Write a protein that binds this ligand. Sequence first.
Ligand SMILES: CCCCCCCCC(=O)c1c(O)cc(O)cc1CC(=O)OCCCCC
Lengths: 233, 235
Amino acid sequence: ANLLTSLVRAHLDSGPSTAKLDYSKFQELVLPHFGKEDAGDVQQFYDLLSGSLEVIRKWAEKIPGFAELSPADQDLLLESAFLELFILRLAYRSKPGEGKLIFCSGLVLHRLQCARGFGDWIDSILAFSRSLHSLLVDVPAFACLSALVLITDRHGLQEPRRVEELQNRIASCLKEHVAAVAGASCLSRLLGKLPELRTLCTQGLQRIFYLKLEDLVPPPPIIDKIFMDTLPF
Amino acid sequence: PANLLTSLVRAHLDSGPSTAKLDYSKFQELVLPFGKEDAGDVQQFYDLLSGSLEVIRKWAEKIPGFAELSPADQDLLLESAFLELFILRLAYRSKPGEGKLIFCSGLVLHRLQCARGFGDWIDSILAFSRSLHSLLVDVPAFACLSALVLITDRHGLQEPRRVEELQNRIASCLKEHVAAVAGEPASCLSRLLGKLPELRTLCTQGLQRIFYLKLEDLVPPPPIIDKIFMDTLPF
Ligand SMILES: CCCCCCCCC(=O)c1c(O)cc(O)cc1CC(=O)OCCCCC
């Protein structure tokens, strides 16, 4: 499809390549102090979230149909899927067999260097990464899946039908791809790990909560809004 | 002083169950099985919190001077210390060598009957309990310590100087007692006061737990607990 192709093109451009990969800050051993954290750690965690939202936003803008949705709805979909997309993209691009977190900017960091800012949450993501990797999801299948996480019903959409339309479009594109390379199943197996993912988002909210409590540095505003809008109260 | 100390001790003892009005009817140390957390666990956790609330208020009312602070400041101090006090009184009352949580009603429960509702937080409390017990804090020393958790600076007080005054009064009372029983005139005291910052950290774990449960939203919190959660979030 030209669609599939546009999805893959959007996806690949939204992450880095082996070249663009940044070992400038990477250290294979750091001796941190567990269960505590300073302002640098907290800022870097927030900055990694921020930059991921910026990248995810540009990625979404290249999904055909997405940019013509209402602004409100664009924001709503992005904000509602952000954490879920952050984790999924992180898990898919990282290298858990080496303890390597690879973020969308190309920044590579070791699990121990992420321990301070992220807490447990980073270990939990790596476990998810390993589990997502054992499914062997190829790039076009993934390029579709990720878009379907974004383009989905959310409460408060102004034009849910347009969203549902686009959702169907992308579903068909995926279905078609997984038929073409076969020559319902992997999918049921994929959906099997969604609870891991729902839990992982939850861990993210808890970690933001905790850091907000700590208040060493204030969250960026859009991250802060997402945190708050996600809360049912 | 003096008689202050005596009023503190009297308030403290009257605010908890007698060794003989203790309730083991619900105690079971063997809990088969997990996994996750059902709704009966969440309600019991909220109910246990609730039950300490009214008791801590009557306890505070018997601290000399406390009723002579502004009503607004009274509410603020209670709400801001509820969690810390709940934990401190629990940690002191309970028996961590045996896994026994003893609540202010007299209800005795095993750490595994509290795990589902409280999560990690109960282990953290028990660790604190064990550590508070190694200090061998006698009842008057404790009767003072608890009051000092309540009577302390908080943001929004109308008369912080008066709160400070009463705080100092109680501090002196404590200092004096710990000198009169340890060897005059500190280590033990600086070790006692060491527990207050730990207690804040445990309050934090409580908020995190309430957050998480509010997120899960099996059962909603009681409004007054909910209000305390919300008022004591700086946002
Ligand atoms: C785990 C609790 C989720 C239930 C919360 C209900 C609201 C969900 C929602 O639609 C919503 C929104 O309308 C705007 C937002 O900015 C955020 C959300 C929350 C949402 O997308 O679910 C969890 C992940 C949030 C960050 C990607």
